[PDB]
Design an enzyme around this catalytic site. Structure first.
Site, PDB file in Angstrom:
ATOM      1  N   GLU A   1      -3.300  13.392   0.989  1.00  0.00           N
ATOM      2  CA  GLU A   1      -4.531  12.952   1.654  1.00  0.00           C
ATOM      3  C   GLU A   1      -5.265  14.165   2.250  1.00  0.00           C
ATOM      4  O   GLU A   1      -6.401  14.471   1.875  1.00  0.00           O
ATOM      5  CB  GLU A   1      -4.169  11.922   2.725  1.00  0.00           C
ATOM      6  CG  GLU A   1      -3.546  10.700   2.114  1.00  0.00           C
ATOM      7  CD  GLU A   1      -3.765   9.445   2.904  1.00  0.00           C
ATOM      8  OE1 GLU A   1      -3.321   9.409   4.069  1.00  0.00           O
ATOM      9  OE2 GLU A   1      -4.351   8.495   2.357  1.00  0.00           O
TER      10      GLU A   1
ATOM     11  N   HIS B   1       2.164   9.064   0.796  1.00  0.00           N
ATOM     12  CA  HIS B   1       1.070   8.839  -0.141  1.00  0.00           C
ATOM     13  C   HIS B   1       1.334   9.746  -1.312  1.00  0.00           C
ATOM     14  O   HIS B   1       1.791  10.885  -1.119  1.00  0.00           O
ATOM     15  CB  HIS B   1      -0.300   9.180   0.481  1.00  0.00           C
ATOM     16  CG  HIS B   1      -0.560   8.464   1.767  1.00  0.00           C
ATOM     17  ND1 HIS B   1      -1.314   7.313   1.846  1.00  0.00           N
ATOM     18  CD2 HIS B   1      -0.098   8.695   3.020  1.00  0.00           C
ATOM     19  CE1 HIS B   1      -1.337   6.885   3.102  1.00  0.00           C
ATOM     20  NE2 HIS B   1      -0.593   7.698   3.831  1.00  0.00           N
TER      21      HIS B   1
ATOM     22  N   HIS C   1       3.920  10.986   6.169  1.00  0.00           N
ATOM     23  CA  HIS C   1       3.398  10.703   7.502  1.00  0.00           C
ATOM     24  C   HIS C   1       4.467  10.103   8.402  1.00  0.00           C
ATOM     25  O   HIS C   1       4.946   9.007   8.139  1.00  0.00           O
ATOM     26  CB  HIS C   1       2.232   9.714   7.377  1.00  0.00           C
ATOM     27  CG  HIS C   1       1.039  10.329   6.747  1.00  0.00           C
ATOM     28  ND1 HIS C   1      -0.021   9.588   6.256  1.00  0.00           N
ATOM     29  CD2 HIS C   1       0.718  11.624   6.566  1.00  0.00           C
ATOM     30  CE1 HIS C   1      -0.925  10.411   5.765  1.00  0.00           C
ATOM     31  NE2 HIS C   1      -0.509  11.654   5.953  1.00  0.00           N
TER      32      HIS C   1
ATOM     33  N   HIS D   1       0.834  -1.215   0.000  1.00  0.00           N
ATOM     34  CA  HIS D   1       0.000   0.000   0.000  1.00  0.00           C
ATOM     35  C   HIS D   1       0.869   1.266   0.000  1.00  0.00           C
ATOM     36  O   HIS D   1       0.426   2.325  -0.412  1.00  0.00           O
ATOM     37  CB  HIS D   1      -0.954   0.032   1.215  1.00  0.00           C
ATOM     38  CG  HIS D   1      -1.732  -1.234   1.422  1.00  0.00           C
ATOM     39  ND1 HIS D   1      -2.766  -1.613   0.593  1.00  0.00           N
ATOM     40  CD2 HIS D   1      -1.648  -2.188   2.379  1.00  0.00           C
ATOM     41  CE1 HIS D   1      -3.276  -2.755   1.023  1.00  0.00           C
ATOM     42  NE2 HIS D   1      -2.618  -3.125   2.105  1.00  0.00           N
TER      43      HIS D   1
ATOM     44  N   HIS E   1       6.054   6.973   6.157  1.00  0.00           N
ATOM     45  CA  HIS E   1       5.713   6.563   4.804  1.00  0.00           C
ATOM     46  C   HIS E   1       5.096   7.755   4.097  1.00  0.00           C
ATOM     47  O   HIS E   1       4.903   8.819   4.688  1.00  0.00           O
ATOM     48  CB  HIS E   1       4.696   5.423   4.820  1.00  0.00           C
ATOM     49  CG  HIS E   1       3.413   5.801   5.486  1.00  0.00           C
ATOM     50  ND1 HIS E   1       3.239   5.689   6.845  1.00  0.00           N
ATOM     51  CD2 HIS E   1       2.281   6.387   5.013  1.00  0.00           C
ATOM     52  CE1 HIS E   1       2.050   6.144   7.176  1.00  0.00           C
ATOM     53  NE2 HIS E   1       1.450   6.577   6.080  1.00  0.00           N
TER      54      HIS E   1
ATOM     55  N   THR F   1      -5.603   6.590   8.041  1.00  0.00           N
ATOM     56  CA  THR F   1      -6.209   6.854   6.737  1.00  0.00           C
ATOM     57  C   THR F   1      -6.275   5.602   5.880  1.00  0.00           C
ATOM     58  O   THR F   1      -6.706   5.673   4.739  1.00  0.00           O
ATOM     59  CB  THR F   1      -5.463   7.926   5.956  1.00  0.00           C
ATOM     60  OG1 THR F   1      -4.160   7.450   5.609  1.00  0.00           O
ATOM     61  CG2 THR F   1      -5.384   9.242   6.744  1.00  0.00           C
ATOM     62  N   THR F   2      -5.810   4.467   6.403  1.00  0.00           N
ATOM     63  CA  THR F   2      -5.988   3.170   5.752  1.00  0.00           C
ATOM     64  C   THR F   2      -6.722   2.262   6.722  1.00  0.00           C
ATOM     65  O   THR F   2      -6.650   2.460   7.932  1.00  0.00           O
ATOM     66  CB  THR F   2      -4.627   2.495   5.421  1.00  0.00           C
ATOM     67  OG1 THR F   2      -3.831   2.424   6.613  1.00  0.00           O
ATOM     68  CG2 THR F   2      -3.851   3.317   4.417  1.00  0.00           C
TER      69      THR F   2
HETATM   70  C1  LIG Z   1      -0.460   5.453  11.482  1.00  0.00           C
HETATM   71  C2  LIG Z   1       0.378   4.541  10.580  1.00  0.00           C
HETATM   72  C3  LIG Z   1      -0.519   3.498   9.981  1.00  0.00           C
HETATM   73  C4  LIG Z   1      -0.636   2.332  10.751  1.00  0.00           C
HETATM   74  C5  LIG Z   1      -1.464   1.276  10.356  1.00  0.00           C
HETATM   75  C6  LIG Z   1      -2.119   1.408   9.131  1.00  0.00           C
HETATM   76  C7  LIG Z   1      -1.984   2.577   8.368  1.00  0.00           C
HETATM   77  C8  LIG Z   1      -1.196   3.654   8.758  1.00  0.00           C
HETATM   78  O1  LIG Z   1      -1.125   4.760   7.888  1.00  0.00           O
HETATM   79  S1  LIG Z   1      -1.624   6.145   8.182  1.00  0.00           S
HETATM   80  N1  LIG Z   1      -1.880   6.897   6.766  1.00  0.00           N
HETATM   81  O2  LIG Z   1      -0.549   6.848   8.941  1.00  0.00           O
HETATM   82  O3  LIG Z   1      -2.869   6.043   8.953  1.00  0.00           O
HETATM   83  C9  LIG Z   1      -3.037   0.336   8.535  1.00  0.00           C
HETATM   84  C10 LIG Z   1      -2.720  -1.035   9.146  1.00  0.00           C
HETATM   85  C11 LIG Z   1      -2.752  -0.930  10.674  1.00  0.00           C
HETATM   86  C12 LIG Z   1      -1.593  -0.020  11.173  1.00  0.00           C
HETATM   87  C13 LIG Z   1      -1.663   0.162  12.719  1.00  0.00           C
HETATM   88  C14 LIG Z   1      -1.606  -1.222  13.430  1.00  0.00           C
HETATM   89  C15 LIG Z   1      -2.713  -2.129  12.881  1.00  0.00           C
HETATM   90  C16 LIG Z   1      -4.078  -1.613  13.330  1.00  0.00           C
HETATM   91  C17 LIG Z   1      -2.675  -3.597  13.309  1.00  0.00           C
HETATM   92  O4  LIG Z   1      -2.344  -4.000  14.423  1.00  0.00           O
HETATM   93  C18 LIG Z   1      -3.179  -4.463  12.143  1.00  0.00           C
HETATM   94  C19 LIG Z   1      -3.663  -3.395  11.137  1.00  0.00           C
HETATM   95  C20 LIG Z   1      -2.598  -2.301  11.368  1.00  0.00           C
HETATM   96 ZN   LIG Z   2      -0.270   7.596   5.840  1.00  0.00          ZN
END
Ligand SMILES: CCc1cc2c(cc1OS(N)(=O)=O)CC[C@@H]1[C@@H]2CC[C@]2(C)C(=O)CC[C@@H]12
Ligand SMILES: [Zn+2]
EC number: 4.2.1.1
Length: 258
Positions: free
Chosen positions: A104, A94, A117, A62, A92, A196-197
């Site tokens: 975003e 976007h 981010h 992603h 990371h 945001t994911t």
């Molecule tokens: C915040 C960094 C960030 C972390 C996470 C996601 C996306 C992010 O991007 S953003 N754009 O910064 O929100 C998606 C997957 C998420 C994970 C946090 C830990 C989680 C929930 C688990 O244990 C299994 C699923 C995992």
């Molecule tokens: Zn992000």
């Protein structure tokens, strides 16, 4: 058929597996600069990255994450709207298929070419997995990227991307200094929001810097050569991996500056 950024599994589909997608504090949002309110009583950000220890870079299908050793207080974010200490775990980006989109968050509906981010977790919760279950578990520092002059501090990241082209590939990535990715000013907007994911958990204090960094067209072009797919699967370029702005609902965006 898991979530992604395509026609059949993109942001408009996520709510089926993750109903919080339609929740009360979803991110990203449009930052209406005229409606944001200056909050004296907001403290200066404290970004302490001098002892940051990067370990690895990973294509997770992603985005790509530059991961840090977060087993000690080495790179921390504090101050601003935050109570306590938040530890850097990864950063990371976007980005778009075109320079005219990719961020975003938007600013008065303006989209930037990309958005960085820097993800931090509240040390009172012991680790990241516990922190994401808390309303004040994470603090994400968001930084816009515009296309212009190169960002010299980004180049080491750009140059390793050829080694992590496809989903699941990782590479050693030590001694990377994230201070090289920060703009001059730490003026910011802040509001309560979410990942945001998927799983879109409502655990994030967002801190979005007003000043973008400039990256070169060649730098962002190299982001766009990454793949969403695994090796040996049909090639789909990792581009437009951004969620659009979500309704602000019952939230006020605060500014650290006038
Ligand atoms: C915040 C960094 C960030 C972390 C996470 C996601 C996306 C992010 O991007 S953003 N754009 O910064 O929100 C998606 C997957 C998420 C994970 C946090 C830990 C989680 C929930 C688990 O244990 C299994 C699923 C995992
Ligand atoms: Zn992000």
């Amino acid at each position: 058929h898991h979530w992604g950024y395509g026609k059949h599994n993109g942001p408009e589909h996520w709510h089926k597996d993750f109903p919080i997608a339609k929740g009360e504090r979803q991110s990203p949002v449009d930052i209406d600069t005229h409606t944001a309110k200056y909050d004296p009583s907001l403290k200066p950000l404290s970004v302490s990255y001098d002892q940051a220890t990067s370990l690895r870079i990973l294509n997770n299908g992603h985005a790509f994450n530059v991961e840090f050793d977060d087993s000690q207080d080495k790179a921390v974010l504090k101050g601003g709207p935050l109570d306590g200490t938040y530890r850097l775990i990864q950063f990371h980006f976007h980005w778009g298929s075109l320079d005219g989109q990719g961020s975003e968050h938007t600013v008065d509906k303006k989209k930037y070419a990309a958005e960085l981010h820097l993800v931090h977790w509240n040390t009172k919760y012991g680790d990241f997995g516990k922190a994401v279950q808390q309303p004040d578990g994470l603090a994400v520092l968001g930084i816009f990227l515009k296309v212009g002059s190169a960002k010299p501090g980004l180049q080491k990241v750009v140059d390793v991307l050829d080694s992590i082209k496809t989903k699941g590939k990782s590479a050693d990535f030590t001694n990377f200094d994230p201070r090289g990715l920060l703009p001059e000013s730490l003026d910011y907007w802040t509001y309560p929001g979410s990942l945001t994911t998927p799983p879109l958990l409502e655990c994030v204090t967002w801190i979005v810097l007003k000043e973008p960094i400039s990256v070169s067209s060649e730098q962002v072009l190299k982001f766009r050569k990454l793949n969403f797919n695994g090796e040996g699967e049909p090639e789909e370029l990792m581009v437009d991996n951004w969620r659009p702005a979500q309704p602000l609902k019952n939230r006020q965006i605060k500014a650290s500056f006038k």
